[PDB]
Nucleic acid binder design. Structure first.
Lengths: 129, 146, 154, 120, 54, 160
RNA sequence: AACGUGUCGCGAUGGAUGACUUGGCUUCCUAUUUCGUUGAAGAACGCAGCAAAGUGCGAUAAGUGGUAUCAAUUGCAGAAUCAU
RNA sequence: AGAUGUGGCCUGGAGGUUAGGACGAAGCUUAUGGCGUGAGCCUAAGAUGGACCGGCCUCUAGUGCAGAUCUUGGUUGGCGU
RNA sequence: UGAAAUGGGGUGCCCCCACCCGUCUUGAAACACGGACCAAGGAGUCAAACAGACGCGCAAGGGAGGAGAUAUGGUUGCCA
RNA sequence: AAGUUUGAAAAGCACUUUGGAAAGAGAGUGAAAUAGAACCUGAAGUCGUGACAAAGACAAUGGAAGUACCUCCAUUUCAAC
């Protein structure tokens, strides 16, 4: 089920935003926080300090939220949830949830391969027959 | 008398059929054609509706609402099977009799079910063709009952 | 658990360990690690010589302030030291891993030593009395020690 | 040890239940052939009763019930056994609700119970 | 005080809150309905004993 | 109200080379000199201790309570809302389902079952019945073990 | 070269998180509900085949008596032998 | 400094709704990638675990940490000094 | 059908760019003060009076409070 | 201060062997012993050990942009393509 192709997939910035000076301290998480420091260099934009998030980094809104395969990812907990995306399968693809099972995961792999909807974490061997 | 206009403001942001996951809004309504969450596609909500729904082999059912038996449920949803080899414009033209809004989707969905069934036929054949070679140490059968 | 590493061909091998041995960690770190490649018989020779203060146990880490010595030249460091307390312990552990190997049908004269490892162990505390009515921890520092051996042949 | 709504009072009154309550609480069902005769759904287990395990890993064993250990919430049977490390056998205890009473010992106050239970 | 707001006369100065320090004169009606079902149960029982006197 | 408080704690002050919070007074125990009387201290007070005089119960206008029930019934007569509100309602003969008055005559419960299966309501009461699970949450430990879906209420004019 | 740095695989030191809960807090109700010179509350010593603490008990001491219950208690030893 | 907005992200619970789980829940670990400007989400693997639990609407609060000579527990360089 | 390829990730290197955080301050990289590491705790809350926005009902009327009355004079409870 | 919460059940490791002993190596119980007594999960921080990457003194980290070597995580392709 070859995806709906979009325009060019160019990302504005691939490298993540990490908070200022988290490498020094082991408890600081790489997640972003906006520095409120008054003399803080990053807040003042010193050229060679880390860059902040803006409204300006948006993803182009055409290719936005599209995985590298060309499918916007819709989660699925059971074989009945495959039916919603039967019709739009050119656009959406399913993602089996983490907790869904070795037993239910057997079913959804079948009833996806029959309908031609695509699963990301669904077994790929039926596709590479 | 509870117009569709008024009921769509009520069920819009909360529902059994809403199913918004990961920022996407699909709809788990059985009467949606393509599955988007919008008025034209809410089957349970509208006063007249239709669906292209599969049946055995390649037959294409169509379920159809109408103004009149709108309450009284086993009587408000009426299914009619089209024959196996039915043209898709045949099914769409049925739906367009009831709800001309859906004339396009019912076509695309009519051709869709026809694709699925002939897809199930190739698959279920190829799975069993190579399922013979496998020696299973168990299998289960539900015993016929009288 | 323990045994951070696995012997290749464990059918020819002898594991041994001691745990929570009362002895200094930083001294046993130094006197164990010298062995790590040496065949068994030459690792025992090394120790009986250290007790005789002919050869020495080179301290590569935990050197903070130590006497320089001329017996550390063979190992490349200037600093060395002769920790009998911790040599006599490793004497008995190597003598155990030789008893394991001999019950496994092996000749201990060909056993080579692999993977010697020393870790800190739960340290037990005692007090100390200081000027102006202070008390400060006197705690000691035992070690865990584990090693295995393997044969070698042409 | 009655079931309450509160589960904090229920579990408390259950595990602090004295001996006699622990006799009722741990009671096996008795086989259909003894339900037919005495018309009783279940009885509390006595010492000598002969009894069959339905519940587990011993499922299908048959034994005489050496003694009822009410402190461990357990029954000790005959021919339900395990060997220690050193080779002696130790009676493996089983909970009564997992077990079935085939043949029950009778004494005069145990009969005054079966008359007193009768559903008919 | 700042702005055009009214001049607050709330009289809370006396110790009322039962601060870890003090006890404090707080009356709470959380038992209102349980005493509503009680005054009734006790009008019935007296009606049952007074019978058949009005 | 006394929780996290009973102590003799005072503050050592400046000049002791330590934080200025109050500290427990005494000796020979593990908590001697430990911090007290503050939300940060292990075991101090909570920040703003909860009270019984919180406003638990809200008034409602008598009218709006009436308006709200009235308005809630007009939604019970619409099969489309009821569809999405969650009940099965598939084989239900008609929206304000209505039944006889003899329904109050049943005594055994086995017969009231085949009633529900006759007006089709047995399909919804199998939605409640198959949905019973043990909770995810701490509520299990509070006295609520099980969650059930909400069912097909039945309205009988007399208490009887 | 040695020390030292860095990444990964495993391993120790350490005891967090979650899951678990016979505890706490608070709200409510019932009643032939209120101690003591007829020696109370509190205090001390003691008591078990084996018994430090704890619980129970007082030279009749891990209990006597009476009724109800209906075969245990149980870490070990001991013990009338099932109609009370 | 400050004001406000968000169909805006996270957390413990209550009313609903829809699902998952011994064919492996929460928790945990990872040169596991994918999505979002971001808070964060989600999948993969565990040679981790052993029984709970997710989404969505609404309600609710003891709801988001790096700094206080912050509190408690642990550890640590100085130092085999 | 094993590989090829694009993207993400890791480690090192090169050319270049780059003062240490939070804070009081006209002014902090400061020879200004707090600062070894981590885990778990850790700070605009509750109540009342008044006001103005915004949501809702009703409207020259609006709304109770306390209590009473029964379905319930019932129910372990769900019902405070 | 302190959950004494191992496990379904103590089945709480008989026995051989090195040791003065502690213990070690085997074996055995059990679905798990990396559930072996503080015994469920077992995090952060710090330390050991094998492998490996390199690296001059510009304290270290940091930005941007390449390349070198890995990674085998992802997506895509494999023939009138």
């Amino acid at each position: 089920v070859k995806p709906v192709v979009t325009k060019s997939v160019v990302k504005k910035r691939t490298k993540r935003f990490t908070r200022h000076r988290y490498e020094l301290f082991p408890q600081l998480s790489s997640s972003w926080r906006k520095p409120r420091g008054e003399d803080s260099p990053v807040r003042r934009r010193y050229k060679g300090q880390k860059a902040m998030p803006n409204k300006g980094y948006g993803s182009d809104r055409a290719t936005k939220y599209i995985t590298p395969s060309g499918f916007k990812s819709f989660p699925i907990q059971n074989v009945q949830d495959l039916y919603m995306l039967v019709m739009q399968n050119r656009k959406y693809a399913g993602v089996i949830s983490h907790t869904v099972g070795a037993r239910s995961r057997k079913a959804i792999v079948r009833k996806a391969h029959e309908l031609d909807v695509r699963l990301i974490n669904g077994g790929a061997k039926l596709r590479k027959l | 008398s509870h117009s569709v206009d008024l009921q769509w403001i009520l069920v819009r942001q909360n529902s059994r059929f809403l199913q918004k996951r990961g920022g996407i809004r699909m709809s788990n309504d059985p009467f949606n054609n393509n599955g988007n969450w919008t008025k034209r596609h809410c089957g349970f909500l509208n006063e007249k509706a239709a669906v292209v729904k599969p049946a055995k082999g390649g037959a294409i059912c169509v379920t159809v609402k109408d103004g009149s038996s709108n309450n009284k449920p086993r009587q408000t949803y009426r299914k009619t099977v089209h024959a196996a080899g039915v043209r898709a414009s045949d099914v769409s033209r049925a739906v367009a009799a009831v709800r001309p809004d859906l004339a396009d989707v019912s076509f695309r969905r009519a051709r869709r079910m026809a694709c699925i069934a002939s897809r199930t036929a190739k698959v279920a054949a190829a799975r069993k063709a190579r399922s013979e070679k496998i020696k299973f140490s168990r299998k289960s059968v539900r015993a016929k009952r009288h | 658990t323990h045994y951070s590493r696995k012997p290749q061909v464990s059918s020819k091998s002898a594991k041994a360990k001691v745990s929570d041995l009362r002895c200094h960690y930083k001294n046993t770190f130094e006197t164990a690690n010298v062995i790590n490649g040496m065949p068994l018989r030459k690792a025992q020779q090394l120790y009986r010589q250290v007790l005789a203060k002919t050869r020495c146990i080179p301290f590569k880490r935990y050197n903070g302030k130590i006497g320089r010595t001329a017996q550390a030249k063979e190992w490349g460091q200037t600093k060395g030291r002769w920790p009998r307390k911790s040599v006599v312990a490793m004497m008995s552990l190597l003598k155990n891993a030789e008893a394991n190997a001999i019950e496994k049908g092996l000749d201990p004269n060909q056993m080579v030593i692999k993977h010697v490892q020393v870790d800190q162990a739960a340290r037990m505390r005692r007090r100390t009395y200081r000027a102006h009515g202070r008390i400060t921890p006197y705690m000691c520092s035992p070690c865990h020690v584990q090693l295995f051996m393997s044969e070698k042949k042409e | 040890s009655i079931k309450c709504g509160s589960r904090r009072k229920a579990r408390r009154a259950h595990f602090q239940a004295p001996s006699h309550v622990r006799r009722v609480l741990m009671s096996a069902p008795l086989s259909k052939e003894l339900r037919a005769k005495y018309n009783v759904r279940a009885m509390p287990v006595r010492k000598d009763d002969e009894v069959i395990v339905k519940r587990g890993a011993f499922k299908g064993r048959e034994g005489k019930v050496t003694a009822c250990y009410r402190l461990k919430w357990v029954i000790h049977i005959d021919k339900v056994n395990r060997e220690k490390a050193n080779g002696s056998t130790v009676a493996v205890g089983i909970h009564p609700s997992n077990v079935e009473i085939t043949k029950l010992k009778l004494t005069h106050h145990r009969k005054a119970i079966l008359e007193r239970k009768d559903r008919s | 005080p700042k702005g055009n707001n009214a001049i607050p006369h709330v009289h809370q100065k006396k110790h009322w809150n039962p601060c870890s320090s003090q006890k404090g004169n707080v009356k709470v009606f959380l038992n209102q309905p349980a005493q509503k079902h009680r005054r009734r149960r006790l009008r019935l029982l007296k009606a049952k004993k007074v019978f058949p006197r009005p | 109200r006394l929780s996290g408080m009973n102590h003799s704690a005072h503050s050592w002050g400046t000049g002791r080379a330590v934080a200025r919070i109050p500290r427990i007074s005494g000796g020979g125990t593990s908590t001697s000199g430990a911090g007290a009387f503050g939300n940060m201290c292990r075991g101090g007070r909570m920040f703003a201790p909860t009270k019984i005089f919180r406003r638990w119960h809200r008034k409602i206008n008598l009218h709006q309570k009436r308006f709200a029930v009235v308005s809630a019934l007009a939604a019970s007569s619409v099969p489309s809302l009821v569809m999405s509100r969650g009940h099965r309602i598939d084989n239900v003969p008609e929206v304000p389902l209505v039944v006889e008055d003899s329904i109050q005559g049943y005594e055994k419960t086995k017969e009231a079952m085949a009633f529900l299966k006759a007006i089709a309501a047995i399909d919804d009461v199998n939605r409640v019945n198959d949905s019973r699970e043990i909770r995810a949450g701490r509520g299990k430990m509070r006295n609520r073990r099980y969650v059930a879906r909400r069912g097909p209420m039945l309205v009988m004019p007399n208490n009887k």
